[model samples]
Target: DNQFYSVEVGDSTFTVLKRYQNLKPIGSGAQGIVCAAYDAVLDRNVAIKKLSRPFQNQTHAKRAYRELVLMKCVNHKNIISLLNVFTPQKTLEEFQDVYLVMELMDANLCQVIQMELDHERMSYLLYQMLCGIKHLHSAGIIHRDLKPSNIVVKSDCTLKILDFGLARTAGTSFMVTRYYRAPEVILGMGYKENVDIWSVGCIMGEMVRHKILFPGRDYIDQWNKVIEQLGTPCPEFMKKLQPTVRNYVENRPKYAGLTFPKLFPDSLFPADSEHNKLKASQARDLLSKMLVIDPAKRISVDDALQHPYINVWYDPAEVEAPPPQIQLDEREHTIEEWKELIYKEVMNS
Candidate 1:
């Protein structure tokens, strides 16, 4: 029999599989715990994400299914790859665990944001993020959550987007993290791929300023923060809001907004170089387009990829790569039914 050791992560404890040796906890969140482990079979380091109480509720069950299905479907250099999946249980009744194995990365964007990046590195990082988002958009998938913690990078500045639990078809939920959320999502308005663009703008701004661009306490406050900085929405955008929402928004004080240069001043950026002339100006132009409060006015991923700042680093192959088709079951499943479905998937893999 293979030896197993009990590993405590957050409030849960898991009996880790022996195949993954030398386990060490690297990160944890509402989703579950992640550990860096050496795979004996492959002789390589891999990340194992243990789903926490996957069948605890309908919401958790659906998230578990979406994460599994989407990760298996999407494949790109800028997106994290799922290597293998399994459950240690032998029977459906005993199955309550799901382990996702993924390629190991050096560090997540949360760490990278603290480091001062030159124009070249900053632009390249943004280019990869756009490429990854474009891939998902091509597949008709929306990554609702696009925060720094969900993006990882290698030492060479290679980037990969991960954590698909909140991802779904276009016009989905408002479950994205508040700091990076677009105004449309906060107002319960229908959203699309451009929502991710708004998030990318916040992230890029954070990287440059080393602070969150909009730090809101709640959904309403989040909207207030966005408008306070980006200024109140135009009548064109307000017309799309619900009656009560529109009334409330129209009553709020209108802001004229700060200029992009003032919002993201050159003093906040590193000094430009011979190879990176006009870097700050081009980046600010892209950010201004992405941070628009109105989705209609927001920059689409395709156009954002071609922006002068990002386009310089883009390659046709990465931008236009064919994405895998993903099909989702529309009908809802009960907890027991979901358990059985996931158990079969684990065993077959």
Candidate 2:
């Protein structure tokens, strides 16, 4: 009998409702799919994450639960909240899937940035992103995956951190994701919370400048790109890393041996004829600091908060509150109505 039902833990249930009448599937990722479901009990719309059947190993299952628990400890206004959790009695093969419930969000930051770029909304979006990241770092959590896709922008210009699948409590060893991954992660250096700052710098380039700041096609390419920009780390860098990392570096690339600025001259110094060279120089300096090969010399989150770029674009008062929750019903509307509704909600606010 126990094996046939959804398991309940904490204040949540492990049951699946027979009628997902108002639930709409919104997005899916490597490990799961998210649906916008109406909670009959709470009478509100919530996001539900259903794990992919094939990848549901015990290790991943435990990490999923642990992530939820750790997320509860974080209360930043920009971070998404885990409202509930549910497990189906049947396994994925039996149409039973694990579910992670949380506040439903609108389009993610990736979409917003693209939309903003098309309409020249970069300045506003960039300011908000820095604010969100600043708030997150202040809370002592490192979002390992700092891509646009992980940031959710609400209807009122509020941004929230989503997809904790790659997130870790401050100072944890395991890191995930590739593009925008901190150089420490790439070089096997001992990482810290500031790793997120490095990614933030990368995201800024990708979203605003319309290309990857360090577009390494592979591991070797990534290594070369890093060396080109930040030069090479000294002996002190290896001393701070773990033995495994140091051994690998010794056998492979020495941090100080690589030269990056000369390798990517275009990145470090934009075209002499371009009007944006001044701005590019600013970006180059900031990015170089963020992606410093030596973790010891890398810019910290606190220092980054103090940087002229962040302060120049940020407004403290604007980031103190969570965006109002958006309510959605099961009503079907034409695509035109959907766009109009979103425009009114976002712009009117």
Candidate 3:
């Protein structure tokens, strides 16, 4: 067990001063590597997301700051906590990378959905998702990216929304991940908070099937896949979009080859597939509404919360858990207790 005592930033050093035993890098992405670090003060494990120095540019820098500020403000049980912010050492050229520390989770939503959940778990998962999105929308934030990879599921089966790097302030225009990127964003039509809902629909659809709803090979493939399931964009809407759409989509191989049932393979579905059943049909209908190609027609989060799939399993009256209490001596505490405390504090504040 290696203890982490200090992290250096440029010329400044921040001390941990708490007991942390295992220092391990757990995940990596375009942003950089995420390391698992023990928090002595908190008596728990946490994740430190370090930004790769090579990927550092002015735009990425601004995004990092925005993510830090947003995470700090968004204190909700369904969302990951931005526990600490620090700059790694500059002594080793690699150490110069800046990092944001967050609550460590056992696995991401994609992994958990694959391993623990099946078609039956949609209601519970969607209910939790609605809770998190409702919190964000209330705070006037839009999570530009709402894919499964960005959602973390803890050991208790609770969900936490992570990675606000792609989130936008309500009524802003920003493109995040290409596949999950809102159509309005691609057309430069500008998007609203509801974009998150669209993404939620995509994720929910994927969860039920255990595969990507729209696994686009490229920009054109991505565009065609979405449109086939949802429908082609209106002429007025297309006019507002970037001109490159017509040229790129028209010439791209995916545009011609993409089909909904073909890519999804209806044969893969269970005999008397769930779609024919009442519960599954209702869920699929709600997902279709959320995934409308036209952003203007897309269902809003408020509306989504009231959808049958979500309402069936959701309890709006259900209160969130509190934040964990840090003790000098490491001891065990339930996540439920921590969430309850934190939720109360956030609501009051």
Candidate 4:
């Protein structure tokens, strides 16, 4: 057996390749453990993600496959690049781990959102987010889970979207975080790419307000929070829902919703400046379009890129750049089938 270095994190110990030294844990979540390590061979810092029990169940297997394939396929400056993937296991039978190497970012958007950001910075950051999402959409992929923590940023204001564990193709069933969950998702309606736009709207609103726009205790409460702020869905949107869901929603208290200016006040925004043309009015206008109660009425990625607030810094090349060819098999596969494919990828790497 090849010798490997061991690092202890909390109650767990991780076995890593010897070439990677000075391991320091940076992030850990339900998906896996992430660490900042110096790659001796490449002489660069990288973020390594050790996926947890990738083959534990059908759901886990599908998630692992989706993440690996998406990471390898997406190639964009605003999206996190997958440098390498490997497994220390020598054989398919022994394989139980998978590690992904990615470009190291200074910090995630969660930390950045806490700081006082001017209109210029906020607009630029949102621009990059839309660019990254537009690229993904171009490839027919939907980033269903888009929140502050999944987005990373460099000191130079460059931002990258990461974490594809919950991402899927368009027309997929609802699977998103509660606070950022779109109304269509709550209604059990099959959703498409616009679902991501809803998430972006919630995130942008939070960036401006410094708190979650809809902090619901549960899915029902989440829907309540959304309708309370965005008003009841139109009959056209309600017509698409299941009979029971539509009945329940129709019976809920009708809300007229707050005006965009009232919901996002000028006081909540940074003062407008001469050098920066961004205004609270422009920002609120874009937010209003994005945070629509009906998915059909929500702003598309292309339209959002052209909005006055975001188009100031827009470059055609950046907005229209070609995305990587993404090939994902939507059919359900057994755990062994997934294991076989992942093992082949690791061995090839």
**Model 3 TM-score relative to the real fold:** 0.72
lDDT of each residue in 92-185, candidate 1, tens digit only: 8778789899989999898999899888889899999999988887876777668898899999999999866346544546433568877777
Clashes of each: 0, 7, 12, 0
Compare candidates 1 and 3 on lDDT and give the better one: 1
Candidate 4: give the clashing pairs: none
RMSD of each: 1.9, 12.1, 9.9, 2.0
Higher-lDDT candidate among 2 and 4? 4
lDDT of 2 by residue, 1-349 (tens): 3422342333234354542336666764643466676777787777777655412344454454445544555565566776765444433233334466777787876676555242114444555655666565554445666777777776766667775534433333442246677777766555776777777777765654566666766756776665555555576776777787567555655444333344334543335654445555555556666766565677876566566544455555755544232223224445344434323322222
- C-alpha lDDT values of all predictions: 0.82, 0.56, 0.61, 0.82
Structural similarity to truth (TM-score) of each candidate: 0.94, 0.64, 0.72, 0.94
Q: Sort by TM-score, best first: what order? A: 1, 4, 3, 2
Candidate 2: give the clashing pairs: 5-89, 14-87, 227-260, 228-260, 228-261, 229-260, 233-255
lDDT by residue for model 4 (1-349), tens: 3756678853456677888888888864654578888989999999888887788887778777777887887778899988888777788999988889898899989889888788789999999999998988787777666788889999899999986634654454533346776777667687777788998899899988898899866877888888888888888888999999889899999999988888988888766664433487888999999999788889998899999999998998889998777536577888999999888877775
lDDT of 3 by residue, 31-115 (tens): 4466677877788898877555422443444455455556767678788887766432323322334556788898877786565
Model 4 collision count: 0
Candidate 1's displacement at residue 263, Å, is 0.3
Residue 266, candidate 4: Cα error in Å is 0.6
Which is the better candidate, 2 or 3, if ranked by TM-score? Answer: 3
